[PDB]
């Protein structure tokens, strides 16, 4: 649904660097010597800490984030279980004090330990390569 | 074409993977093959057996762009567990066709859960892209990435 791509981000980036509001979110890059990065959809990853109906709380190394609308997403290997490591493609609803996403997808990344160990590096590498 | 912009060599070919946005910004003039870490956002067409092979179209993302892709027959055969000719032979035998239906569902789940390295041939003249191979991420990829970030 979203026009812009699902940017890889850590919770801290939304929590600390996001500006604007609904329909006009910006990631500040002033420190990195670059202009604002517009964002609507994101790719985030984390451990499921809590799940109740189509809502979940997830944890990446930088902090927690909430996900809603999970009853609507494609049904891969079930992963709405505390302890599972998962990816979410979501539309940003809120950034601070806790980032909140409306889910497009949530899928399991628990089988392969490399995903969790690579994620922080993936976010850094991607952000190094956006003008 | 007998020349390349040397300043984009790492941008297109650095391990463990590269970015679709960077590929597109380079404005390729010839078919260019890159490796990206991507997931499927959505399927965009039916699974077809036209031509006696499997095909399907999907929109993938690597976090930097969307790209509509086709998947090679061999990938889909591996995921379903039946080639098209095998599926057609199975139909007259309920127990065999049931194995195929189970494979179809397995393929569906596999494509929902897909998050891996995709080797993609992008043809800028035809605005077409074909996924040639899939690879699970491994520790060599992690080390490649750390090296790139000098960590």
Swiss-Prot record, chain A:
Residues 28-98 bind DNA. Keywords: Acetylation, DNA replication, DNA-binding, Nucleus, Phosphoprotein. It is found in: Nucleus. Changing residue 8 to A: Abolishes interaction with RMI1, TOP3A and BLM. Phosphorylated during mitosis. GO terms for cellular component: cytosol; nuclear speck; nucleoplasm; nucleus; RecQ family helicase-topoisomerase III complex. GO terms for molecular function: DNA binding. GO terms for biological process: DNA repair; DNA replication; double-strand break repair via homologous recombination; maintenance of rDNA; negative regulation of double-strand break repair via homologous recombination; regulation of sister chromatid segregation; resolution of DNA recombination intermediates. Changing residue 119 to A: Abolishes interaction with RMI1, TOP3A and BLM. Its main location: nucleus. InterPro entries: NA-bd_OB-fold (IPR012340), RMI2 (IPR032245). Essential component of the RMI complex, a complex that plays an important role in the processing of homologous recombination intermediates. It is required to regulate sister chromatid segregation and to limit DNA crossover. Essential for the stability, localization, and function of BLM, TOP3A, and complexes containing BLM. In the RMI complex, it is required to target BLM to chromatin and stress-induced nuclear foci and mitotic phosphorylation of BLM. Belongs to the RMI2 family. Component of the RMI complex, containing at least TOP3A, RMI1 and RMI2. The RMI complex interacts with BLM. It is linked to A homozygous deletion of RMI2 has been found in a family with a Bloom-like syndrome and is probable responsible for the phenotype. Patients manifest depigmented skin lesions, multiple cafe-au-lait macules, and growth deficiency. Cells from affected individuals show a high rate of sister chromatid exchange and increased chromosomal breaks. This is RecQ-mediated genome instability protein 2. It comes from Homo sapiens.
Curated annotation (Swiss-Prot), chain B:
It comes from the Eukaryota. It is found in: Nucleus. Disulfide bonds: none annotated. Essential component of the RMI complex, a complex that plays an important role in the processing of homologous recombination intermediates to limit DNA crossover formation in cells. Promotes TOP3A binding to double Holliday junctions (DHJ) and hence stimulates TOP3A-mediated dissolution. Required for BLM phosphorylation during mitosis. Within the BLM complex, required for BLM and TOP3A stability. Component of the RMI complex, containing at least TOP3A, RMI1 and RMI2. The RMI complex interacts with BLM. Directly interacts with RMI2 and TOP3A. May bind DHJ. Interacts (via N-terminal region) with BLM; the interaction is direct. Belongs to the RMI1 family. This is RecQ-mediated genome instability protein 1. It comes from Homo sapiens. The chain holds residues 475 to 625 of 625 of the full protein.
């Amino acid at each position: 649904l979203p026009r812009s791509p699902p940017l890889k981000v850590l919770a801290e980036q939304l929590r600390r660097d996001a500006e604007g509001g609904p329909g006009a979110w910006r990631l500040s890059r002033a420190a990195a010597g670059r202009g604002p990065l517009d964002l609507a959809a994101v790719w985030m990853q984390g451990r499921v800490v809590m799940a109740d109906r189509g809502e979940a709380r997830l944890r990446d190394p930088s902090g927690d984030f909430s996900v809603r609308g999970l009853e609507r997403v494609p049904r891969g290997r079930p992963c709405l279980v505390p302890g599972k490591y998962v990816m979410v493609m979501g539309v940003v609803q809120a950034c601070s004090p806790e980032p909140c996403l409306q889910a497009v997808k949530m899928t399991d990344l628990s089988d392969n330990p490399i995903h969790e160990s690579m994620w922080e590096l993936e976010v850094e590498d991607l952000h190094r390569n956006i003008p | 074409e007998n020349s390349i912009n040397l300043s984009i060599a790492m941008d297109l070919y650095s391990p463990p993977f590269v970015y679709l946005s960077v590929l597109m910004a380079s404005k390729p003039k010839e078919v260019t093959t890159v490796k990206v870490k991507a997931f499927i956002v959505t399927l965009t067409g039916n699974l077809s057996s036209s031509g006696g092979i499997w095909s399907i179209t999907a929109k993938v993302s690597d976090g930097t762009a969307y790209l509509d892709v086709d998947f090679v027959d061999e990938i889909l055969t591996s995921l379903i567990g039946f080639s098209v000719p095998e599926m057609k032979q199975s139909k007259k035998d309920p127990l065999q066709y049931q194995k195929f239906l189970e494979g179809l569902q397995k393929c569906q789940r596999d494509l929902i859960d897909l998050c891996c390295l995709m080797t993609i041939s992008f043809n800028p003249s035809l605005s077409k892209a074909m996924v040639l191979a899939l690879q699970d991420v491994n520790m060599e990829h992690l080390e490649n990435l750390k090296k790139r970030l000098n960590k």
